[PDB]
Amino acid sequence: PVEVMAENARTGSRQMQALTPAQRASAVNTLADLLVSREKFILDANAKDLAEAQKSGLAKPLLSRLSLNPAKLKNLSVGLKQIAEDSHKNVGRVLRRTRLADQLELKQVTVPIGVLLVIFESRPDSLPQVAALAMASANGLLLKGGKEAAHSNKALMELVKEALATVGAEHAVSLVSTREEISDLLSMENHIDLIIPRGSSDLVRSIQQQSLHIPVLGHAEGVCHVYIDRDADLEKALRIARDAKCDYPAACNAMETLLIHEDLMSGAIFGDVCNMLKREGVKIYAGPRLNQQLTFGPPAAKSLKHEYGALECCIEVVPSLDEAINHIHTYGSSHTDVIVTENDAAARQFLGSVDSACVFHNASSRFADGFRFGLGAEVGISTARIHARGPVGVEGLLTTKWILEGQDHAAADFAEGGGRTWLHETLPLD
Ligand SMILES: NC(=O)c1ccc[n+]([C@@H]2O[C@H](COP(=O)([O-])OP(=O)(O)OC[C@H]3O[C@@H](n4cnc5c(N)ncnc54)[C@H](OP(=O)(O)O)[C@@H]3O)[C@@H](O)[C@H]2O)c1
């Protein structure tokens, strides 16, 4: 039903709130180890899932993204191991700590957020990550996955609950039914704390319309960008384009725009660019500047913003770095932006100039999924300007509290006739 889930979440919050790290650490340890042994189960489950998906036949890249292979499995295992290793100081670690007056202390401890309602596209590999995140931050979690991996989702939840069997708190993680339950649950506020819809434009809007006294954070858009200039190895440019647009064609952070310094169009590098783009079979487009530049050129574009989410692209030429920054800040979505150059001056210039959630010099637009940032398992990427930037790791799921204990103080003791005066020194935290 509806409020039974809410009360189970509150019970999990109360339990994990009084569960010392000794419990949850071993909990995610067993989660990993059990994900290693019984993986054949979830393997065949996701096999059936992708089989029935292909039988339905939505779209080949989507079939690739909802797929699953032992490689990602071992990667998730070692990532959760890293989390468990470095999660002993999540809830309870002090951030600030001072001493205002004589015999009066003030600190700022971390604190669980409570109940989160995460929504996310099929992406069956995420469920273990997000569940490990909740179990490691000791906050109630509700789930909702795409109907595609439904069986795989249920299997993974069987896994995480057989893991929870060692701690007894069998409620902090749950599943839900179709979006009707999601609506009626988002309605019953005063029991939820955040909503993390991992990728939905219209559904970001819908949650907003249904966000009655409840915050929202996630990512609704991901238009990345790349750039090259007169001081970059052609080979590095080629292979970076390859890595960027040919690992997960349409996951979250695949670039869909190229930018070139006009003094490199004569260098025929555009030729090899299209050569490799066609060796991978990608229908490049172009916009105003290039579409004028060439004899008659590849076909025209519509809007430099439209995300395509498949083996497509767009190429424009820019007169100068200034135009590059203007173009990025005016068309991008501050998701993840790259460059390639040898002149370190232009490098730091572009780094400090652009504003995106990620900036990269001589690297790939693919390095943004938290895991490859050594952050361990994560929930998504944040485009917004509050509470996080980029991969929302653990620390993106924790807020602060001001506990303040004294002997006998008051407000007037600091007035004109008071007997104690401020110090405002920051003692070394424990
Ligand atoms: N930035 C990128 O590179 C990139 C790439 C691919 C996808 N994405 C994001 O992922 C989305 C793709 O669609 P999706 O089906 O895969 O999203 P989803 O995570 O599967 O969410 C379920 C879908 O049901 C629909 N709906 C109506 N009411 C809903 C409710 N209360 N709760 C949940 N869903 C409700 C939503 O819109 P629909 O009916 O239209 O699905 C929603 O997309 C896109 O909107 C996009 O934001 C981003």
Numbering used by the authors: 347 to 776
The paper states:
The bifunctional enzyme Δ1-pyrroline-5-carboxylate synthase (P5CS) is vital to the synthesis of proline and ornithine, playing an essential role in human health and agriculture. The P5CS molecule contains two domains, GK and GPR, catalyzing the first and second steps in the biosynthesis of proline from glutamate. The GK domain catalyzes glutamate phosphorylation, and the GPR domain catalyzes the NADPH-dependent reduction of γ-glutamyl phosphate (G5P) to glutamate-γ-semialdehyde (GSA). Our results describe the assembly mechanism of P5CS filaments, in which the GK domain forms tetramer and the GPR domain forms dimer structure, and both domains form specific interaction interfaces.
By focus refinement of the GPR dimer in the P5CSMix filament, we determined two additional states of the GPR domain. One is the NADP(H)-binding state, when NADP(H) is present at NBD. Upon NADP(H) binding, the residue R525 interacts with the adenine moiety. This interaction transforms the 525REE527 loop into an ordered structure that extends the α16 helix in the Rossmann-like fold. Meanwhile, the entire NBD rotates approximately 15° along the cylinder axis and slides towards CD. A similar phenomenon was also observed in ALDH1L1. This transformation contributes to bringing the nicotinamide ring of the NADP(H) close to the catalytic residue C598 of CD. Conformational changes triggered by the binding of NADPH subsequently initiate the transfer of the hydride ion from NADPH to the intermediate G5P. In our models, unliganded, G5P-binding and NADP(H)-released states represent as open conformation, and the NADP(H)-binding state represents as closed conformation. However, in the closed conformation, when the nicotinamide ring of NADP(H) approaches the G5P-binding site, the substrate tunnel entrance may be blocked by NADP(H). Next, NADPH binds to the GPR domain, triggering the conformational change into closed conformation, which brings the NADPH towards the catalytic residue C598 and facilitates the reaction.
